[PDB]
Write a protein that binds this ligand. Structure first.
Ligand SMILES: O=c1c2ccccc2oc2c(Cc3ccc(O)cc3)[nH]c(-c3cccs3)c12
Ligand SMILES: [Mg+2]
Ligand SMILES: [Zn+2]
Length: 299
């Protein structure tokens, strides 16, 4: 069946980005089959000029995508392939519609897309954090990412020179490590402070790296920015994994507001300053806060 899935994917035509709706910040994957998410992923690499600029063979990219998808656990309610897929779609949208693409190099864009898709590989559920803060989980996710990138027939970075390769792996590693909320909390102050004093400069290597980390977090948490009906469903999945280990929702509203205020709002507000075109993420996050708050006050 696996080889059958690869055949089907490899031979299928890839619809335009417009048709796949991957340029929209409000994108949802609920109506898509796994095969369709694989197609959207190919379009992301294609439209970001990655397939061309790095000479990726169609057969290899397809196999790599399927290996990545296969290495997420479907039995985990939220931290699964759909989450990684959505994180990558948000990166694509931020780069295109958010106009962030022009602010980065091709290697950085290549690393960001790969990281987004690979950032939660082999996640076993928040409650099943069984071992055998240096973000131990993120290190495992990266290890899985590297293993797949080095698997025979899955080497989508074979077209890069060794120097490009080492640079890309480093960015990929930092990007995945950045998805550790402890690191976000630890580094956001500097980012907020720089934007505050209007001293933010992407030309500065340290600030460029800091920005890449913040962007990863923004895409990682982007479910919190989706249209209300979508966000409710995503929150339902997170709740399932967190509680149902896969009162009740009488506390979810307040916790959602707590999460939005403590982690999300500031980040999307900062992102909008760096690029006004990313406003929809902030707008969606604000609309969901209002909705959750109304419920928290008992509707
Ligand atoms: O993603 C996270 C999250 C990630 C890492 C660590 C903690 C996190 O907490 C999140 C919440 C708070 C929450 C509140 C009530 C629940 O039943 C479940 C979760 N909502 C979310 C949601 C994320 C996106 C839409 S809702 C949370
Ligand atoms: Mg993670
Ligand atoms: Zn994640």
């Amino acid at each position: 069946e696996e080889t059958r899935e690869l055949q089907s994917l490899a031979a299928a035509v890839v619809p335009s980005a417009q048709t796949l709706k991957i340029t929209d910040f409000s994108f949802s994957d609920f109506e898509l089959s796994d095969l369709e998410t694989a197609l959207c992923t190919i379009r992301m690499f294609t439209d970001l000029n990655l397939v061309q600029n790095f000479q990726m063979k169609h057969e290899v990219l397809c196999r790599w995508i399927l290996s990545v998808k296969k290495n997420y656990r479907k039995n985990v309610a939220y931290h699964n392939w759909r989450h990684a897929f959505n994180t990558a779609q948000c990166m694509f949208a931020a780069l295109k519609a958010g106009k962030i693409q022009n602010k980065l190099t091709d290697l950085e864009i290549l690393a960001l897309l790969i990281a987004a898709l690979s950032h939660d590989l082999d996640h076993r559920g928040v409650n099943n954090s069984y071992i055998q803060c240096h973000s131990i989980m993120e290190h495992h996710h990266f290890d899985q990412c590297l293993m797949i990138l080095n698997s025979p027939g899955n080497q989508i970075l074979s077209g890069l020179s060794i120097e490009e390769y080492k640079t890309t792996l480093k960015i990929i590693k930092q990007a995945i490590l950045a998805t550790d909320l402890a690191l976000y909390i630890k580094r956001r102050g500097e980012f907020f402070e720089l934007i505050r004093k209007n001293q933010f400069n992407l030309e500065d290597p340290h600030q460029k790296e800091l920005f890449l980390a913040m962007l990863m977090t923004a895409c990682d948490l982007s479910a919190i920015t989706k249209p209300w009906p979508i966000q409710q469903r995503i929150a339902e999945l997170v709740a399932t994994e967190f509680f149902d280990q896969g009162e009740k929702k009488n506390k979810i509203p307040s916790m959602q507001v707590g999460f939005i205020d403590a982690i999300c709002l500031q980040l999307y507000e900062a992102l909008t300053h760096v690029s006004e075109d990313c406003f929809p993420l902030l707008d969606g996050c604000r609309k969901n806060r209002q909705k959750w708050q109304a419920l928290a006050e008992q509707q």
